[PDB]
Amino acid sequence: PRYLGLMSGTSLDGMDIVLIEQGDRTTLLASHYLPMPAGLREDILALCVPGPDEIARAAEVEQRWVALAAQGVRELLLQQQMSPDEVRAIGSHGQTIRHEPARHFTVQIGNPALLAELTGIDVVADFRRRDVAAGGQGAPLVPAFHQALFGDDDTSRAVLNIGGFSNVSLLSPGKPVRGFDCGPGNVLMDAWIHHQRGEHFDRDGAWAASGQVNHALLASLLAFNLPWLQEHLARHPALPAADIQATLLELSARSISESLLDAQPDCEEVLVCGGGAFNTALMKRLAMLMPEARVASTDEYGIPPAWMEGMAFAWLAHRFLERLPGNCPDVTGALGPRTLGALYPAGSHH
Amino acid sequence: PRYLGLMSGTSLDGMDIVLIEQGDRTTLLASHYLPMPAGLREDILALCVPGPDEIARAAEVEQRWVALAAQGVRELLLQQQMSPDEVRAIGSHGQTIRHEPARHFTVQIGNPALLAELTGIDVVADFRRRDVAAGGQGAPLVPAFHQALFGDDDTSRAVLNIGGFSNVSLLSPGKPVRGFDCGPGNVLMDAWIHHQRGEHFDRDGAWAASGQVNHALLASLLAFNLPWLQEHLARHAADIQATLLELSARSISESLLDAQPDCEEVLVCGGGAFNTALMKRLAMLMPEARVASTDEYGIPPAWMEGMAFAWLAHRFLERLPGNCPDVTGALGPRTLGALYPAGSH
Ligand SMILES: CC(=O)N[C@H]1[C@@H]2OC[C@@H](O2)[C@@H](O)[C@@H]1O[C@H](C)C(=O)O
Ligand SMILES: CC(=O)N[C@H]1[C@@H]2OC[C@@H](O2)[C@@H](O)[C@@H]1O[C@H](C)C(=O)O
Structure with a gap:
């Protein structure tokens, strides 16, 4: 099937959007890069260290992040003459604002329900959390x-x-x-x-x-x-x-x-x-x-x-849907193999 | 199929945990109430208004909340002499710490990936967010x-x-x-x-x-x-x-x-x-x-509320809509929730 992958690393320069075909092998079909606005970058960075009113602030910030990601998806699909119905799922990393596995938590924002609403595509996201829950570094x-x-x-x-x-x-x-x-x-x-x-x-x-x-x-x-x-x-x-x-x-x-x-x-x-x-x-x-x-x-x-990193997250969406493990416990330190992520369905059909 | 429902309202006295059988009708098989320790209630109340270090505080508080929920789940199943393998999914409301539809956000904590890890049962959670994303009150x-x-x-x-x-x-x-x-x-x-x-x-x-x-x-x-x-x-x-x-x-x-x-x-x-x-x-x-x-x-x-959340887990897995748009104001019918599978270890 076809999958989208969304990666936004910690440098905050922009977002990688990829489209893969996954079968016996993994192949890149298309890719798209979208810059991150200075204001959004500054606002995400300010969430990377402890501060006031974080819950509300993160909520507002992630809505802008998701709108940007959705636009990126839309543009890639336009270029490829593809309907969202042709994509099985988006694997979204989200955006890390805190990572403290010694305290057993990792925080990626990026409201996957909203991303599903805006794109009309099933979203698999929140990949690190199960690894941390299993004692790994995520x-x-x-x-x-x-x-x-x-x-x-x-x-x-x-x-x-x-x-x-x-x-x-x-x-x-x-x-x-x-x-x-x-x-x-x-x-x-x-x-x-x-x-x-x-x-x-x-x-x-x-x-x-x-x-x-x-x-x-x-x-x-x-x-x-x-x-x-x-x-x-x-x-x-x-x-x-x-x-x-x-x-x-x-x-x-x-x-x-x-x-x-x-x-x-x-x-x-x-x-x-x-x-x-x-x-x-x-x-x-x-x-x-x-x-x-x-x-x-x-x-x-x-x-x-x-595009390697973006492709990994598209692949992780596939692994989730196939119920295959997505971590490497010898590398993460988790207790064992785990299915990673959470599914936020588009549900377009009602 | 059988579903667990988990609800913890804003009064913070304790958790309602129910076990339903869902077929043509919805029937209650068993129910269990687990009081919340004063320390956990206090720390949640402190997250219900704006304050410092919220990301880290909420992360650590939800770990405790989930450990409690998992205990409640294990206890109910024990009471019924029932293997978790007999349960299709848990529908978990989580714990609301902020709810502001006017600013298009709602926040329920309760780390569902950790809940799946501890219980060994698929978890459907985070039910309010898609309704809000579709313009509703959640x-x-x-x-x-x-x-x-x-x-x-x-x-x-x-x-x-x-x-x-x-x-x-x-x-x-x-x-x-x-x-x-x-x-x-x-x-x-x-x-x-x-x-x-x-x-x-x-x-x-x-x-x-x-x-x-x-x-x-x-x-x-x-x-x-x-x-x-x-x-x-x-x-x-x-x-x-x-x-x-x-x-x-x-x-x-x-x-x-x-x-x-x-x-x-x-x-x-x-x-x-x-x-x-x-x-x-x-x-x-x-x-x-x-x-x-x-x-x-x-x-x-x-036990209506607990049952409603077991039912919402069912609705998610059935790929049927879960909201009430004429009540919430959402644009239309939506699948509610997100699935965190237990998977294999
Ligand atoms: C918590 C988090 O976002 N970690 C990132 C980060 O960015 C690079 C490095 O630290 C790596 O450990 C990880 O991402 C890469 C893509 C990974 O998960 O392999
Ligand atoms: C945001 C949130 O947690 N809302 C709760 C709360 O507790 C009661 C009332 O406000 C109701 O709107 C809702 O729960 C009930 C069970 C519901 O969703 O129907």
Whole structure:
């Protein structure tokens, strides 16, 4: 069947909307990105730390969030010439405003009943809560999807997501999935080029590629934001800005490769998703630093790297409806496998 | 199939838990009441008005609420020697901590995923939100149950709930259910017999029936708190109770007959259904209608609300509408609730 997925991460830049076909395999049919208004971003951020009148405030904020998500769905369906009746369900992550598994709770807003009302499509949402109820951390949820896509009996694979930070799913045959953070991804390269050039990121890693790595600075870094970095830059002589960028690229490449090889030395394939997959200069370094592995974008395996996360939530909607587990308890720490999410039906037919 | 219903109203005394059998009819198999600890009641009251750190406070409070609910569920099933496997679903209202349809939101807590984890039973919850999302008030929900129980496009009926106060669901041939308030119910009779003899209520209305309606007072009252009664009484004990009974009987019957003069049957639920003397006067004052307890239709008057929520779980799973749009103001009929499956472990 066909499923929509909606993901809005913690950076609050915007919402990913995806349409998948799910059968034997998972395939991306269409995708759509919608920016988040400054006002909505600011209002969500203010809910991410304790404050006054949170119940009412969250209620007003989630209504705007859902309206935006619904518009995003509408536009994708218009582009695809698809009726909402052709979509089995939307898997919506919602928007995390508090995550405290040590206190046994996780809070994602995004009024799924309202989302069902506005879209006319069944909504599956609230995926993390059952994992936390079963004693897990409620995160990360993507490794179960990584396993469904890429796990097999025969190959040691690492599925590497390079966003602001880097995280990996280790798919070792005959074993359960493992997952951990590898280190920084794009976070410092973004911050540096912003501080220096006003750009939000370094396109294709071209700026970095134009500079030369400074090995002294690199050693200091290996031994994450700007105040931290500035404290480092003061300890070294003035460097050209591009050399700093080149050095920051190498930091991520080395931190990732070192963490990956330490945990899975026999790794045969590293499959890279997230926006970092588009940083050509970074992909180049990762491949040089892991010469015994094939390092490639997930695009080469039929999953476009920018849309992996959104696709996971579409997939989680499918898992719910099929009553199959959606978590990976070895990674989340839950007592065992659980069906994740809650169903808010459109019910258009009355 | 069999369904559990879970209700915890805003008085916060305890949880009503019922077990129904649903087929062609709705029948009560068992019921259980679980008092709420003072500490939990206090913390919920504190979340019913705006205050600090609400997200985290509500999260931790609802964990306790759910643990209690799960205990109530396990206890009822134990009492019946019944495996949770025999139950299709729990319909859980949750606990209302904020309700503001004017700002298009309603908030019931009660972490249904945790409820499913602890009970091992599918949970349907969060019933009010889709009605609100469709432009309705999100309340009251019980008239949809009244309509399903007693509605048909051919007889004029009223379902009268007598609690502290009185409300009625009008079932008119063909029409969606409508509803309204009809003034006081048990509130004054309870207030007065408490103040006068320390009793919580007037059992069977026998105190009121031992007295005579003083017609002066009745006319005054007809022209609601304990000191409000005492204002009236000075300008003039069992006669008083009798006159309070008549007050409710007259105001209720007059409201009902204005709205549907054609009423053929008045079905009474709530604890007032047990007030034999009140029921007698209501029957005298609506002589064209048969006045009877819902118990005469297999629906125990004290357990309507719990039963309504087990029924709403059934309606969700049957893919049938759950709201009463002519009551709530919603755009039309909607499936109410969200499903949190127990699944496998
Ligand atoms: C509570 C929450 O929203 N966690 C997110 C967050 O954003 C990234 C990281 O922290 C990850 O643990 C998780 O999301 C990804 C998509 C995941 O669940 O795998
Ligand atoms: C928002 C909310 O919890 N409403 C309750 C409340 O308690 C009584 C009254 O206000 C009624 O409107 C409703 O419950 C009843 C059972 C209902 O929904 O029919």
